């Protein structure tokens, strides 16, 4: 979404899909990253697509 | 300071073992900092400067 | 010099919405936090949701979560909330009022400190 | 969400001093001291007269007390004159970023 408005500097939100309760039921999860700690995925411009 | 208030929010990732990560951040954004007092840092940086 | 004229009152439907604008005057909206204020005939004060006008990040406490929309126009200097899904509950004035200073370092946004006050403006409903 | 209380009317006596008050919870009232009072005339809109408990906010008497304690707080006013006569409502914010208000009490006459 982007805030874009400046005075500001924000933290990235991100999701996953996890190993849960049971192992072969993965499942959605979502998580706050600071921005050095995620990357972009891929030369695929998916610029949703981010790495760890 | 970090102004942020942020919170933790566990996931279970794998059998019995979990991962903390941060949730929502409550009230507004801020930018975290360090502050100093400047007549102190300038007498000690000429302090040093003499030295 | 300080001013916070509102736009005039407007009677709805229930289920309608309505767009409700704050005018700044005597000073720059992108200062201080803007808040948004109810008052009912026979009740309280209520307190509907705060924006940062830069970013135009907000908080409404559970009551007006989906209700309230929230924009600003800082070029225009005015501030705006909108309401969707009336109810007979929503015959009431309406203030806007402006917070706290709005620092890099340490957070004003959320705390009761109205320092000046829109003269009211009310949505109603029959 | 909103919560905050107080008595909802009361009257004082001139020359005298009365106590009006307001109660929450640890995590609204107790957790932040961060509190303030409002008097609003009807036709008319609010104007601050306490903020942070006992900061003296602009054009407010001496007669206007400002004081807190654990869950509960107060305008326990003094001298208590005839000039005020409508509502002096109470205020303060939760742990979970938002303001609350009081359900307003009547400085009646008086």
């Known amino acids: 979404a982007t805030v874009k408005n400046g005075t500001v500097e924000e933290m990235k939100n991100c999701s996953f899909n996890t190993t849960t309760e049971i192992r072969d039921k993965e499942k959605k999860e979502y998580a706050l990253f600071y921005k050095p700690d995620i990357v972009p995925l891929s030369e695929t411009n998916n610029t949703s697509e981010y790495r760890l | 300071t970090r102004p942020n208030n942020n919170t933790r929010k566990s996931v279970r990732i794998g059998p019995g073992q979990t991962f903390y990560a941060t949730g929502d951040i409550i009230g507004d954004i801020k930018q975290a900092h360090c502050n100093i007092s400047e007549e102190k840092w300038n007498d000690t940086l000429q302090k040093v400067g003499i030295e | 010099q300080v001013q916070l004229v509102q736009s005039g009152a407007e009677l709805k439907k229930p289920g309608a919405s309505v767009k409700v604008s704050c005018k700044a005057s005597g000073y720059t909206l992108s200062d201080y936090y803007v808040h948004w204020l109810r008052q009912a005939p026979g009740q309280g004060l209520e307190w509907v949701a705060w924006?940062?006008?830069?970013?135009?990040?907000?908080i409404s406490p559970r009551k007006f979560q989906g209700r309230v929309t929230m924009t600003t126009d800082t070029s225009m200097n005015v501030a705006y909330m909108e309401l969707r899904g009336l109810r007979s509950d929503d015959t009431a004035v309406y203030f806007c009022?402006?917070?706290?200073?709005?620092?890099?370092?340490?957070?004003?946004?959320?705390?009761?400190?109205?320092?000046?006050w829109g003269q009211g403006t009310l949505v109603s409903v029959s | 969400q909103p919560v905050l209380t107080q008595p909802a009317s009361v009257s004082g006596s001139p020359g005298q001093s009365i106590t009006i008050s307001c109660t929450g919870s640890?995590?609204?009232?107790?957790?932040?001291?961060?509190v303030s009072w409002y008097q609003q005339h009807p036709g008319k809109a609010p104007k601050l007269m306490i903020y942070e408990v006992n900061k003296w906010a602009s054009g407010v008497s001496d007669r206007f007390a400002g004081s807190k304690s654990g869950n509960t707080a107060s305008l326990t006013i003094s001298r208590l004159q005839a000039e005020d006569e409508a509502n002096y409502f109470c205020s303060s914010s939760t742990n979970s970023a938002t303001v609350i208000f009081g359900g307003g009490t009547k400085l009646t006459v008086l």
């Open positions: 924006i940062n006008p830069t970013s135009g990040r907000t």
């Open positions: 640890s995590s609204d009232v107790g957790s932040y001291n961060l």
């Open positions: 009022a402006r917070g706290g200073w709005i620092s890099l370092y340490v957070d004003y946004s959320y705390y009761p400190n109205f320092d000046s």
